[PDB]
Ligand binder design. Structure first.
Ligand SMILES: CCOc1cc2nc(-c3[nH]ncc3NC(=O)N(CC)CC)[nH]c2cc1F
Length: 265
């Protein structure tokens, strides 16, 4: 978990930015491994909790944490996913085939199925947080808002409504501050829409309160251009208002698995 600063070489190139600080490209001596380094009392405790979640995860469709390092600032060292965020990649590559989109979306469902089995809630499942190793290999990242579920509870109860990605949140998250694996299923539906819309932002030109009002009317985002009917049907099934009737990740992954192999053959 605790890495040697002497073995870490940070580059001038910045991969991303947020409230925490920045994400930069780096190199760590193991063979030398190319890494993405998240560089930062509240923010420090958030990074330590994020690292504790990532250390417990072992799946090919989840970004692996190398370890943590305390130097000029607190650092969270992760394996490098060269192609970067899914939303930005699809915005730059509009000629990416529909079969390729299903493939990447199915890989996210496989990673989320494992996360569901591991009893962890993502709480930030969006296209910007899906990183590409190759054009045919996707991994789930950004575990900053992620929580390890209690052994006696199937949901995480947030005490306060913080800086939340409301457009990706299920109604129970907005109304009761309850976050379950089925809440991540709703986010996955929005992620599916984003992927088939080639990195377009969901609910464009709308306020968070307007989105809540839209979903209460029973209204959902329209079918993206070129998106298959079966894939839009899954988006709508992920967008089931009532938690109990909404499918889990095992049912979502199976539907994607079967449809992907139908397109392949
Ligand atoms: C052309 C390279 O573009 C990028 C590659 C990137 N590779 C990463 C990466 N690899 N491993 C982890 C990360 N980054 C992140 O986890 N985040 C937080 C979601 C920064 C986007 N972030 C990237 C951001 C980029 F703009």
């Amino acid at each position: 978990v605790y890495l040697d600063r002497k073995l870490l070489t940070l580059e001038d190139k910045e991969l991303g930015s947020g409230n925490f600080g920045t994400v930069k490209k780096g190199y760590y001596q193991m063979v030398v491994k190319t890494v993405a380094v998240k560089i930062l009392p509240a923010l420090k405790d958030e990074l330590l909790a994020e690292a504790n979640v990532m250390q417990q995860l072992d799946n090919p469709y989840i970004v692996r944490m190398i370890g943590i390092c305390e130097a000029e600032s607190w650092m969270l060292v992760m394996e490098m996913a060269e192609l970067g965020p899914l939303n930005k990649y699809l915005q730059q590559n509009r000629h990416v085939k529909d079969k390729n989109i299903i493939e990447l979306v199915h890989q996210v469902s496989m990673g989320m199925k494992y996360l569901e089995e591991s009893n962890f809630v993502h709480r930030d499942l969006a296209a910007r947080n899906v990183l590409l190793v190759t054009q045919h290999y996707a991994k789930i990242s950004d575990f900053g808002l992620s929580k390890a579920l209690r052994a006696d509870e199937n949901y995480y109860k947030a005490q306060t409504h913080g800086k939340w990605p409301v457009k990706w949140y299920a109604p129970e998250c907005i109304n009761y501050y309850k976050f379950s694996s089925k809440s991540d299923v709703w986010s996955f539906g929005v992620l599916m829409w984003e992927a088939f819309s080639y990195g377009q932002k969901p609910y464009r030109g709308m306020k968070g309160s307007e989105v809540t009002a839209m979903l209460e009317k029973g209204e959902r985002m329209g079918c993206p251009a070129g998106c298959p009917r079966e894939m839009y049907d899954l988006m709508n099934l992920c967008w089931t208002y009532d938690v109990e009737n909404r499918p889990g990740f095992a049912a979502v992954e199976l539907r994607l698995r079967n449809y992907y192999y139908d397109v392949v053959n």
